[PDB]
Structures are given as structure tokens and as C-alpha cells.
Structure 1
Amino acid sequence: NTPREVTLHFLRTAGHPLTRWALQRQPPSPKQLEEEFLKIPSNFVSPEDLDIPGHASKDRYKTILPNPQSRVCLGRAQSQEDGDYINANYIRGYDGKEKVYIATQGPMPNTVSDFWEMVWQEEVSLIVMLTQLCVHYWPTEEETYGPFQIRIQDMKECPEYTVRQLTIQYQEERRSVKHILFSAWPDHQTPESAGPLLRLVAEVEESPETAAHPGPIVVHSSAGIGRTGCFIATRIGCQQLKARGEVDILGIVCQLRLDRGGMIQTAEQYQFLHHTLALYAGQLP
């Protein structure tokens, strides 16, 4: 037994299944949830676990690093660019389905081109952005980012988020990307309430998946783990509730940390998950 095998074994086997009923009517107590959250290992990687020269200039935070086993590598198919590094991980969706999301930090001014390279390479058609009133990496009208031309076709303000219809063109090929900006979500905090979050999840679910093999949904926030983690854990929890009438929230969080260290930052965020999914249960047939 080493520290890492202990970590991996916990994340791989821990679980606390909650029926619709137990979720709505008899959840674990706030104290039980705090103690449970604290037992979940972070699965952060040490800087000694990435061998990527000069990656630090492309990280917003020195301690929040992409796990190499699930890291998104930039193959540079479209650029004369240098190495393969972006702080972003592939995230498994419902039932362990691969590459349903890419959790990444919001672009820094020097990684905007890398972010757009990733959107192209991975055939991303949906971006979910979580923020509070981070750069303006999309254009007002039209901008070129490296080899890519991005144009905004439409901008629609909803009560809780702004939906932008964008296009990305490389050479002859121009793709549609839907962009959803959800504000009023501070880092290390929860949304103001669960309703706006559930309506964000519904907005994502109702987005048209035209592709034969759909790309990953890009979810980002400042660090790419707290608000990013809450969002993705909420969607997966809704999916489990709807398909099976139960949710294993502890398992969901553990599975997300296998994909990217530190997903879901606070016990309060973890408690809000339970609260949010208790509400979603009530919408169910």
C-alpha cells in the first residue's frame, strides 16, 4: 500500500447510493455530508508528475494541473505551434461514457489561441462558461485567433445566462459553436439558488447534437474544477435520477476526481449538489 494506491482505490470504489425518496425526504445530515466530502481525496497532481517544460506560463494556478492520463493534448494540426499543452482534461459522463466533457480553466490572454485550437481539434460545438460579474476570448463581431476566424451570428440574453451563436472557420470548413455564459456564480461559492442551475442543465440537454460522433462539451471556470465540477456533477446526477431513480453523488464526485484533480472545491458546493438533485427529483415523472 502506497499513498496513491490508497487514493485511487477509494475513488474507484467509494459510493453512497441515494434513492429519489431518501434524497428528497431523508438526506444525509449536513454534518455527515461535510465529513464525507472531507474523506474524498483531491487527486491533484504534483508538478513533478507533469514533465512539460514551460507549462507554468499556461496555468492560471500553480497547484491546479491537468492529470496526465486524461489531459487534452494539442496535436498542433492547424498551427506551427510548440508542444501540446493546455490545462484541460477529458471528463467521463453518465455511466463512464468517455469524453462527454472537457473541463478546462478559462483562457488566459496567452492561451486563447490554444483554447480555440482545442475547440477545433475536439469538434466542440457547445461551450459552458461559469463566472461572476477570466478574459473576453470570443469576439464582439469577428476576430481571428491564430488560424481561426470566429464570428458571432447571434446573442440571446435569458434570465440566467447569455446564449451566443458562434462560428469557427479553418480554411474551407466553418463550424457552429453554441456558447452559454452563466454569471452570478462566484468561485468557492454556490449559485444563488438551484433553479437557474437546473435551467442551465436543461439548456445544455436541449442543445442540438448534430454530429455523428458528438464532441466533448467544454465546461470552464477560472480554475476549471469547482464551478466546472458542480455543473458536470449536477448533469450526471440528473441523468442517473432520470434513468434509474437513484443517484450516487459520492461516486459521481470520486469519478470526476479520477478525470481531473480537485473537482468540486467546497463542502458547501457538495451540499448544494444534494439540494439541487432533491429539487430535480420533484420534476420527475
Structure 2
Amino acid sequence: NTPREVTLHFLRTAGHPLTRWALQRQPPSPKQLEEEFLKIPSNFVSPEDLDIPGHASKDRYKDILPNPQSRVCLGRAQSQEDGDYINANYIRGYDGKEKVYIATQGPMPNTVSDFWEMVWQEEVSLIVMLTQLREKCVHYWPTEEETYGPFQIRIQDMKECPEYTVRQLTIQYQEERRSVKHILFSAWPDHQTPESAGPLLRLVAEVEESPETAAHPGPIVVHSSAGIGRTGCFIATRIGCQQLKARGEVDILGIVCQLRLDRGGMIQTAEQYQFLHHTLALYAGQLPE
């Protein structure tokens, strides 16, 4: 055991399976959940761990880097750029199934073409954006039509729900046109949680109700400014709901551990960990029967 091997062993083996009854009626205490959360290693990579010349300019935060083994590599669809780097990682889903999500940071003006290239190359049909309206991060989608490198994007439809905005986009590359659904969930401040879990579960139903629209199933892109806290919470919620529906139990600790192996730092706060328990207890009470 290196520190690194102690980290990997913990994340592969930690678990706290809870029956749905225990989650709803007899949950671990707040102090227990915080203690449990603080035990989980971050699995952050250091700048020294990454040998990708030039990547710094494509990171929003120099301390938040994509783990090498699961990072998304861009192909060569950009005649302007020579590298394959984007701050994004493939994320396992329910039962360990590969590439169910990509977690990424919010695009910067200089990584917007990279983002759409990833969307194209990975045959993404759904993007989940988690934000607090408060703006600074750049709008990487057009009001009606914009070109980003070799990609033309066009808004087809836009509808407002109280919790989120759904945009139906078309992305074009050469003679080829694809559909992409975009959902912007807007009252989630970074480092914090939403006021209640109702809208979040609606967002989750919205995601679950989304048709596959690509030639081949692709990852769901989930992002927020750093791509770890709110991104991690959303994905953990989705997996946790899937465990509850299929099995009537959930292992929240194991879900967060599996997320951290895929991308360092997923779920950043003990408050966010506690809210995850709350949201899943809510989902359990909403289940049919």
C-alpha cells in the first residue's frame, strides 16, 4: 500500500447498503453521514500526474483535472487544434455499466468547439446542465443559430418548466444533422444544495423520459462549472433512484465511491451527501404502490 493503493482499495470496497425502509424510516444520523462522507478519499489527480502538454489553458480550475484512465479523448475533427484534451471523464452507471455519463466542467469560450466535438464524436443525445442562475460561464448554445468550429447549432424548440429549461437543438457537421436535447436546471448554487428535492426529481424523470436519438446509445453529458460537485450529486441521484426502483435498496456510499474512481472529487460537500439521502428518501416515497 502506497497512499494511492490505499485510496483505490477504499473506493473499490467501501459500502453502506440501506434497505428502502431504513432509508425512509431509520436513516443514519446527520453526524454519521458527515463522518462517513469525510472518510471517502477524493481521488484528485495532481498536475504532475497528467502529462498532456498544453492542457492548462483548457481547465477552468487548475486543481480540478480529469483522471487519465477515464478521460474523454477528442479525435481529429478540428483542423485548427492539434490535441485530444478536454476536462471530461466517462462515468460508469447502474451496476458499473460503462460510459453511461460524461462528467465535464462548463465550457470556457476557448473549449466550446471541444465540447461540441465531444458531443458529436460520442453520439450524445442529452445534455444536463446544473447551475445557479448567476451568467459568468459562457453560453455555448445559440439563441437561434451559431457556428462553433466545424459545427453549426440551431435551436429547434425551447420550453420552460418551473424547474428547468428544455432546449431541442440540431447540431450539424458536413452534410450530417443530429438532434440533441439540452436541459438547464438553474437553482443550484455551487458548493451547496437546492432548497428542496422536488424539482431535482422532476429533472430526473425528465432525463428518464428522454428518447434515445443517436445511431448508437451514447453517454449523457452532465456538467456544472467544475463538473464535480453538482455534477456528482445529479449522477448519484440518478443511480440511487435506479437502485431503489430495481432493488428496493440503495448503497449511496458505494455509488459515491464508484463516481470518485471515474472522476476525482465527485460530490464535494457533506451537506450535498446528506441532501442525496434526503432526495432518495423522497424518491422512495414517490414510488408507485
Bin of the TM-score, shorter chain as denominator length: over 0.9
SS in structure 1 at match of 2:68: coil
Q: Is the 8 A contact 2:124 2:214 kept in 1?
A: no
Distance 1:60 1:171 in 2: 30
Distance 1:66 1:113 in 2: 18
Q: Is the 8 A contact 2:70 2:262 kept in 1?
A: yes
Further displaced range: 45-54 or 211-220: 211-220
Distance 1:110 1:212 in 2: 29
C-alpha displacement at 1:78, in angstroms? 4.8
SS in structure 1 at match of 2:177: strand
Alpha-carbon displacement from aligned partner over 1:159-187 (angstroms, at most 9, x marks no partner): 10000000000011100000000001000
C-alpha displacement at 1:54, in angstroms? 1.4
Identify which of 126, 150, 153 aligns with 2:153: 150
Distance 2:215 2:98 in 1: 15
C-alpha displacement at 1:77, in angstroms? 3.3
Q: Percent identity?
A: 100
Gaps of 5+ in 1: none
C-alpha displacement at 1:230, in angstroms? 0.3
Distance 2:212 2:79 in 1: 28
Further displaced range: 79-88 or 97-106: 79-88
SS in structure 1 at match of 2:169: strand
Further displaced range: 205-214 or 121-130: 205-214
Equivalent position of 1:249 in the other structure: 252
SS in structure 2 at match of 1:16: coil
Distance 1:109 1:278 in 2: 39
Q: Is the 8 A contact 2:178 2:214 kept in 1?
A: no
C-alpha displacement at 1:210, in angstroms? 3.4
Q: Is the 8 A contact 2:72 2:88 kept in 1?
A: yes
Gaps of 5+ in 2: none
Distance 1:284 1:237 in 2: 13
Distance 1:38 1:266 in 2: 9
Equivalent position of 2:191 in the other structure: 188
C-alpha displacement at 1:47, in angstroms? 0.6
Identify which of 230, 233, 237 aligns with 1:234: 237
C-alpha displacement at 1:80, in angstroms? 4.3
Further displaced range: 75-84 or 234-243: 75-84
Alpha-carbon displacement from aligned partner over 1:45-98 (angstroms, at most 9, x marks no partner): 011111011111110001100000000000123534211000000001101011
Distance 1:182 1:189, change over 3 A: same
Alpha-carbon displacement from aligned partner over 1:206-234 (angstroms, at most 9, x marks no partner): 00013453110000000000000000000
Alpha-carbon displacement from aligned partner over 1:90-118 (angstroms, at most 9, x marks no partner): 00110101100000000001100100111
Q: Is the 8 A contact 2:71 2:90 kept in 1?
A: yes
C-alpha displacement at 1:29, in angstroms? 0.4
SS in structure 2 at match of 1:149: strand
SS in structure 2 at match of 1:224: coil
SS in structure 1 at match of 2:69: coil
SS in structure 2 at match of 1:66: coil
C-alpha displacement at 1:148, in angstroms? 0.4
Distance 1:124 1:202 in 2: 18
Equivalent position of 1:97 in the other structure: 97
Distance 1:77 1:116 in 2: 10
C-alpha displacement at 1:158, in angstroms? 0.4
SS in structure 2 at match of 1:110: helix
Q: Is the 8 A contact 2:231 2:266 kept in 1?
A: yes
Further displaced range: 47-56 or 258-267: 47-56
C-alpha displacement at 1:267, in angstroms? 0.1
TM-score by length of 2: 0.97
RMSD: 0.8
Distance 1:231 1:237 in 2: 10
SS in structure 1 at match of 2:110: coil
Equivalent position of 2:44 in the other structure: 44
Alpha-carbon displacement from aligned partner over 1:106-163 (angstroms, at most 9, x marks no partner): 0001100100111001001100000111111100111110000000011101010000
Alpha-carbon displacement from aligned partner over 1:1-53 (angstroms, at most 9, x marks no partner): 11011000000000000001000001000000000000000000011111011
Distance 1:260 1:16 in 2: 21
